[PDB]
Amino acid sequence: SGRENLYFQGHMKPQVYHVDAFTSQPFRGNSAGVVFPADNLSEAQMQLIARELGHSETAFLLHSDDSDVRIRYFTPTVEVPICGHATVAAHYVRAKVLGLGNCTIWQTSLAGKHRVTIEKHNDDYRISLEQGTPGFEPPLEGETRAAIINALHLTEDDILPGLPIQVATTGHSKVMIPLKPEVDIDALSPDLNALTAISKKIGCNGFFPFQIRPGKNETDGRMFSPAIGIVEDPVTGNANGPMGAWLVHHNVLPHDGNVLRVKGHQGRALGRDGMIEVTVTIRDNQPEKVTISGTAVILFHAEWAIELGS
CATH class of the missing domain: 3.10.310.10 (Diaminopimelate Epimerase; Chain A, domain 1)
Known part of the structure; x- marks a missing residue:
């Protein structure tokens, strides 16, 4: 037995x-x-x-x-x-x-x-x-916000309006950075040292800039974590999982049932394309728990x- x-x-x-x-x-x-x-x-x-x-x-x-x-x-x-x-x-x-x-x-x-x-x-x-279950830290603001935005070589004009840049997690925290669709995400080339510097200031070794595909519940993101060995992970479950929870938490994407499904793309610029199916079960319009899937x-x-x- x-x-x-x-x-x-x-x-x-x-x-x-x-x-x-x-x-x-x-x-x-x-x-x-x-x-x-x-x-x-x-x-x-x-x-x-x-x-x-x-x-x-x-x-x-x-x-x-x-x-x-x-x-x-x-x-x-x-x-x-x-x-x-x-x-x-x-x-x-x-x-x-x-x-x-x-x-x-x-x-x-x-x-x-x-x-x-x-x-x-x-x-x-x-x-x-x-x-x-997912978790969120208070939205990053002021000097730190501008620090993260500048390290990506972007301006406030590039961040989705009304949305915060914050740490979301389902096990291994990541800072959500909501970008407008016009932002060329693959052309991003962060100031790696500046990122590790702020990772030590806020206590999060991962930055996850992502954008939403027009008219679809799909995203494209990139996971940068220079504070540790990994410069950029091709496809990160601990980034996309909390992203979906974050999406529900800030009502960024419409959901009908007691669930929100998002196909999170990642790794294109790396030549290592991947896709994680993020399904969030919702209760009281809050992200109760997160499930990630893939092949x-x-x-x-x-x-x-x-x-x-x-």
């Missing part, structure tokens, strides 16, 4: 998958590694593997007693609690390998417990991640040719 499963995840030869998340187009989206089983691996070995692969992050699948699966996420230099694109990549590989079909499962990580939805359709899969494509997978363990 659950004892036989743990025995296998400790005696089977480890494998590695290379997948591009939030896209079905090879070489696009956000790439992430997935290695399993990892039960017979040390925090050190895992960190060494993530450094070897070089993806923004590699997900390691472990055995879980209460949940369906335990995942640990590693950047090439440090472990991280949870990661959006690496998570969809992980469950995409897990669905392919096990031929899961439509269902819902629970994962466990330093970020706690999360439910994931797997939807089979024409040989492929769409992965849904229930991010939970992925496996570039290749292989059984490690070297022994893994100590």
